[PDB]
Design an enzyme around this catalytic site. Structure first.
Site, PDB file in Angstrom:
ATOM      1  N   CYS A   1      -4.920   2.742  -8.187  1.00  0.00           N
ATOM      2  CA  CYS A   1      -5.033   2.193  -9.523  1.00  0.00           C
ATOM      3  C   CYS A   1      -3.891   1.229  -9.891  1.00  0.00           C
ATOM      4  CB  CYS A   1      -5.220   3.311 -10.569  1.00  0.00           C
ATOM      5  SG  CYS A   1      -3.949   4.621 -10.573  1.00  0.00           S
TER       6      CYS A   1
ATOM      7  N   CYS B   1      -0.238   2.024 -10.904  1.00  0.00           N
ATOM      8  CA  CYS B   1       0.311   3.163 -10.212  1.00  0.00           C
ATOM      9  C   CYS B   1       0.325   2.914  -8.711  1.00  0.00           C
ATOM     10  CB  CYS B   1      -0.519   4.407 -10.525  1.00  0.00           C
ATOM     11  SG  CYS B   1      -0.665   4.781 -12.309  1.00  0.00           S
TER      12      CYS B   1
ATOM     13  N   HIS C   1      -7.171   2.716 -16.215  1.00  0.00           N
ATOM     14  CA  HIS C   1      -7.051   1.739 -15.152  1.00  0.00           C
ATOM     15  C   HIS C   1      -8.428   1.178 -14.825  1.00  0.00           C
ATOM     16  CE1 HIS C   1      -2.862   2.727 -13.427  1.00  0.00           C
ATOM     17  NE2 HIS C   1      -2.958   3.536 -14.451  1.00  0.00           N
TER      18      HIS C   1
ATOM     19  N   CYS D   1      -6.422  -1.537  -0.605  1.00  0.00           N
ATOM     20  CA  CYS D   1      -5.678  -1.963   0.557  1.00  0.00           C
ATOM     21  C   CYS D   1      -6.652  -2.590   1.526  1.00  0.00           C
ATOM     22  CB  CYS D   1      -4.955  -0.791   1.214  1.00  0.00           C
ATOM     23  SG  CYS D   1      -3.908  -1.261   2.644  1.00  0.00           S
TER      24      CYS D   1
ATOM     25  N   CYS E   1      -4.854   9.006 -15.139  1.00  0.00           N
ATOM     26  CA  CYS E   1      -5.021   7.754 -15.855  1.00  0.00           C
ATOM     27  C   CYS E   1      -6.373   7.116 -15.550  1.00  0.00           C
ATOM     28  CB  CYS E   1      -3.884   6.806 -15.513  1.00  0.00           C
ATOM     29  SG  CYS E   1      -3.562   6.646 -13.735  1.00  0.00           S
TER      30      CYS E   1
ATOM     31  N   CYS F   1       0.352   2.149   4.017  1.00  0.00           N
ATOM     32  CA  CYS F   1       0.631   1.080   4.956  1.00  0.00           C
ATOM     33  C   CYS F   1       1.772   0.204   4.482  1.00  0.00           C
ATOM     34  CB  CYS F   1      -0.614   0.222   5.123  1.00  0.00           C
ATOM     35  SG  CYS F   1      -2.157   1.173   5.225  1.00  0.00           S
TER      36      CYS F   1
ATOM     37  N   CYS G   1       0.841  -1.192   0.000  1.00  0.00           N
ATOM     38  CA  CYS G   1       0.000   0.000   0.000  1.00  0.00           C
ATOM     39  C   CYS G   1       0.877   1.243   0.000  1.00  0.00           C
ATOM     40  CB  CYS G   1      -0.917  -0.016   1.245  1.00  0.00           C
ATOM     41  SG  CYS G   1      -1.789   1.555   1.614  1.00  0.00           S
TER      42      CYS G   1
ATOM     43  N   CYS H   1      -7.872   0.690   6.686  1.00  0.00           N
ATOM     44  CA  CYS H   1      -7.413   1.455   5.544  1.00  0.00           C
ATOM     45  C   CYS H   1      -8.501   1.522   4.487  1.00  0.00           C
ATOM     46  CB  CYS H   1      -6.125   0.850   4.960  1.00  0.00           C
ATOM     47  SG  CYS H   1      -5.302   1.886   3.703  1.00  0.00           S
TER      48      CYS H   1
ATOM     49  N   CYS I   1     -10.032  -7.315 -12.680  1.00  0.00           N
ATOM     50  CA  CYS I   1     -10.045  -5.871 -12.794  1.00  0.00           C
ATOM     51  C   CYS I   1      -8.694  -5.284 -12.392  1.00  0.00           C
ATOM     52  CB  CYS I   1     -11.160  -5.278 -11.935  1.00  0.00           C
ATOM     53  SG  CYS I   1     -12.797  -5.937 -12.314  1.00  0.00           S
TER      54      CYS I   1
HETATM   55 ZN   LIG Z   1      -3.283   0.817   3.261  1.00  0.00          ZN
HETATM   56 ZN   LIG Z   2      -2.886   5.022 -12.486  1.00  0.00          ZN
END
Ligand SMILES: [Zn+2]
Ligand SMILES: [Zn+2]
EC number: 2.3.2.31
Length: 68
Positions: free
Chosen positions: A50, A53, A65, A40, A61, A25, A22, A45, A35
């Site tokens: 995406c 990224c 994504h 996270c 984006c 985290c 993450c 959290c 998908c």
């Molecule tokens: Zn997280």
């Molecule tokens: Zn992205």
């Protein structure tokens, strides 16, 4: 000579990496699903990012994504 007992564990490597960290985290986030929207799944959290990224949901984006 072959081992009579189990010393080495036979593993299959076709995965990019076990988990994706993450952006906050850096927790072991499971990368599964068709998908391209990542979440996270850390209890507390629930931050969405995406997939490609490794950061926050990039609105730039956004659209490319989510699904891919
Ligand atoms: Zn997280
Ligand atoms: Zn992205």
């Amino acid at each position: 000579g072959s081992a009579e007992a189990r010393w080495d564990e036979a593993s299959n490597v076709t995965i990019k990496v076990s988990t994706k960290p993450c952006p906050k985290c850096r927790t072991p986030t499971e990368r599964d699903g068709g998908c391209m929207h990542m979440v996270c799944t850390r209890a507390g959290c629930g931050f969405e990012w995406c997939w490609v990224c490794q950061t926050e949901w990039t609105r730039d984006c956004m659209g490319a994504h989510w699904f891919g």
